[PDB]
Amino acid sequence: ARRAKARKRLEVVRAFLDSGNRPEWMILEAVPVLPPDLRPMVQVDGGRF
């Protein structure tokens, strides 16, 4: 069961090793923002929004 969890953890490590992702990147300083057209503000017929 120690051998087992060391796998699960090690699978996450070697995940990061082989890709070149930095664990800290699962944290955000700069939150991205999605282009405005993909989340529009529009006037429907009655000039309402």
Add this chain to the structure above:
Amino acid sequence: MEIKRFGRIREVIPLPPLTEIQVESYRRALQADVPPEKRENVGIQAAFRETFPIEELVLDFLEYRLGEPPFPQDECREKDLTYQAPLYARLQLIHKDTGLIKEDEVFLGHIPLMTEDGSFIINGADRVIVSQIHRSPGVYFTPDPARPGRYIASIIPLPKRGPWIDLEVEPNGVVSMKVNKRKFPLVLLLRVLGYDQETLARELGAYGELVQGLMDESVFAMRPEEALIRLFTLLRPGDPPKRDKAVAYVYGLIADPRRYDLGEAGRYKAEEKLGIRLSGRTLARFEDGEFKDEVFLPTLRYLFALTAGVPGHEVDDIDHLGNRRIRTVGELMTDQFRVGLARLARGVRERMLMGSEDSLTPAKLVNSRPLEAAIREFFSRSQLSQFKDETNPLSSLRHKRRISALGPGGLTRERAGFDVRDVHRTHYGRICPVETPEGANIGLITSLAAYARVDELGFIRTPYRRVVGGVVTDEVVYMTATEEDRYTIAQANTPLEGNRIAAERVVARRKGEPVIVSPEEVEFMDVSPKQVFSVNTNLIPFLEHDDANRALMGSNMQTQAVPLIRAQAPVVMTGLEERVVRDSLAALYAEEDGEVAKVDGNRIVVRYEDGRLVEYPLRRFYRSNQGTALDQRPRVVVGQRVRKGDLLADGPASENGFLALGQNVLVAIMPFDGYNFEDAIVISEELLKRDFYTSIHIERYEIEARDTKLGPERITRDIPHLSEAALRDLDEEGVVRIGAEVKPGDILVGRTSFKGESEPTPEERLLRSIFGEKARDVKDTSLRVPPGEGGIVVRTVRLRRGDPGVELKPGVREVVRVYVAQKRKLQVGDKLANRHGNKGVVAKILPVEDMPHLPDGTPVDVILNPLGVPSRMNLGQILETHLGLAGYFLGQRYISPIFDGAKEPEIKELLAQAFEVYFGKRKGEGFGVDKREVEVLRRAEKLGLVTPGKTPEEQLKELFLQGKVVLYDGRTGEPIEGPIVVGQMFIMKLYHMVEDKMHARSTGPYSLITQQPLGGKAQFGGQRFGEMEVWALEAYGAAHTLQEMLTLKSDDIEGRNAAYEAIIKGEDVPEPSVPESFRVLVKELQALALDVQTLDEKDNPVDIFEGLASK
């Protein structure tokens, strides 16, 4: 013509008022006709007495009143208003310290009223409030699905008026208690109520098993108020347990009859269950400083004695109809009312303890709006407030009698198992077992049995005649499913002499099981067969020959029957067709005896014996929710001497007062060369000729002229670049002229709108520089007609503002509505059906010369293929024809009661009396037998239909008695190699017409974010090519055809625009680029901090944005 009735059952009482569930219920909640003094604390009133009085300064409640409506039902219908009444409430504020008294009557807003037929008008659109079925307040016991010998007990109040509590006895001997999913030992609670260890054995003292197990004095080592704080700990991990706040919590959960209400029903149910009276609808009390339990120990009593063996401790069938109950409309709306009042009180005390504690009134301490919006809400977006079904008058009546197990306070679709949907032994005579929808909602939406009524507690119950000794009384009595189970109840048609039970075996049920028993043993008798079935179901003749699964489609398709201009009542009826028109409050009758003064397509005035000249005007050519002309026509002439209750005008789908959902046609039952295939129907052009299966339809077309930041919108007749042809039917203002013919493309209303920051570009300014016409600044935004629609302009409403009466939503100057009519003949694609579940689409219309016909030259109307019958097992349609044959030659209609109607001998007798008319007429007119009738008879004899060695007339007689007649193909004159079944059948046109459903699109509107085409006919949709379709193309290996559906035809904006140029230019279509919708996917993953990268084979990125996102 003459109307023969069958059936030996003398039905004691009539059908009750079939909207009573909707009218009685509401009026019983308003009481707008009871002198306030004489009102009674139920419904609207009861909510007032609940939320009041508001507590520290104290505001109290005197009385409410209702005013008549600002506008009459029609007025609201036209002007998109609500048919409502003003609600005033007289209040007195008094000061908790000085004796202050102010008293105003403050306006609360408008409550929406219920029309006579039991519906509502909400923003000018009739709607119905569907009763809701739910488990009923009470205490129940149910075996534990884990441990075979232990049983959970459950305590259930009205919804959102208390928490559910379970009393599972754990595997540690001492009993548990669940609340907000928090378990804890029960004893801690009983302590808080003042309980003593001995008065437990003093009361339990039987089950050393657990009576002695429940006791654990780690708890007993406290006074009442001690464990009271002991528990607040257990339900509030973090709140400091001050004795002013712990009493506040439990009280506000278990004794405060202000957020814990067992039903009124819930009192009586657990009352007689646990065998204890009950002060209020409340578990616990606060009386003389501490808590005095009411329910917990009685409940505690039952559960224990069950888990040993005790008598009279049964589990409960939670699906029984003594434990399920109905939230009729009045109750459902009061609930919402108790929620506005609740919010309004949160806001008064707020302004009680801030703003000025002595210079205040009822007037300014109340803001009505929280009430207003709670009502408005229940009526405009509830799941029980439904757009009314007024396709025909039955669809409206069936709606008002519907029953949903779904909704706020009930079941979510996923919540719905089997047991909720099953027919219950107790549905008998209360909820129809046929009328339910096929599909997901099966068994949740159901209908009210025809004789059934919901009592004051909200339980369905059904009538039964009392039989004493062996003789049957006329004393009828309505039983809940619970008292029903007490008796042995014999069947509706057990045979009698006078009022004594003749038979020696009687067919009865005890607790719904079928039992054979002697008449001494019999206590009650069904009232009628009609008492087990829906109203619609009761419209089905020969129901007992129809398999259940298509009686159900026969029931439902009725409500879909389109009102026909030449509509007629069925030649075979059940004896309800008249009541249904009555309660459908669509036909028009006479209020007292008198005489007819005038009569007219528009009004009917009648002089009464009371000297009154009442003038009933006629709702002529009204458009219904579903477009189906709701038209009233007059059925008396000047001078006609009219007794009371006689008819004056026929509603829609009514013919002299019988429900006319379709037309009686001459039906032939045989294959017909393919056009019968798989339920398709073949019809005679003669049906369109004499205007059978023709119906009037109207579509409203609205438009608004609004103030803009770029100018106003003008409703004009001045629309740039348009030819006088394109305007010849518009008045000077831009409205089509009432009485015109409008077809696809035609302007109904010209409208102009100002052009934006695309005021002409160079390409366009220059092009006009050539044509000596400079840029015009307004635009053709007119309202045209959509593809596949059109008709005869019947009417126009023009609402401006600046005119009287009128004021519209902000920023709109004027709105114009134009109603458009269409006469609809039957056509290839429309859907037909008969009351037996037989349905099909008209697939071909032959000219009369091709129709099969009988020897005397008459051609059949309809050819229904026989392959429809055997597997569907709906034989009743077969009887309907045979007796329809007879009636077609004796000029008769018949009334065959359900389950008590015309049997086979009785009809074969009729079929002979008709034979003489059909044939004897012949052998005397100078014509004998025919040569093709003998060739057929040769064949019929081999089949075995006729007795060999018998005269042609003898043998044709024998076939006629069989429903069968000789038939000549009109394409040849040669006979049909066999004798056929020809007869008269009642067959309706359904709401499902090709005209409403043919739609197609080359290209059109698209969707904001996805750039994929919209959906639906009204948007000019595209067709969803879903996952399962994609699979289909995938399996075929149609790569390029799939790619096309995934790019050029949906959202590859480049190659889509690129194609529609290639077609119009005659060049093959361009190979496609990336769907714009995949990009949306990328950017949406970026917005989750995920970096998706298109990569070429050597692993370097590919910019699928062609540099538009790079920097």
Add this chain to the structure above:
Amino acid sequence: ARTIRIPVHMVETINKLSRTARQLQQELGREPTYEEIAEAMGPGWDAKRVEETLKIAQEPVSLETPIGDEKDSFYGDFIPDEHLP
């Protein structure tokens, strides 16, 4: 609060209409007209000016608002894309 930010003082006068309209309704037994507001709102207030004040007072609505009692259509799905050609 508002998705469309409106100067703190316009917000202030908007609430004015609301509260005065409310008393008017509590007085009349029905909601007031535009003009019954411009009067009780005093001078410089005409019916026109109460109206265009209300339409900017107007809060937008969700493209994902539910269309039907199931949840297989969004109010946004019935909205054409006028911009792109």
Add this chain to the structure above:
DNA sequence: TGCATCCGTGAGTGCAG
């Protein structure tokens, strides 16, 4: 170590709407 027990994730299609 083996087994309760909780938390999270699913639950047909298209059309009308």
Add this chain to the structure above:
DNA sequence: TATAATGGGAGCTGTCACGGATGCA
């Protein structure tokens, strides 16, 4: 801009079955 004011308020109930991760005799 100045009496004094000092810890919230509404839970929502009638599905189910599997797979995984965690707690416990």
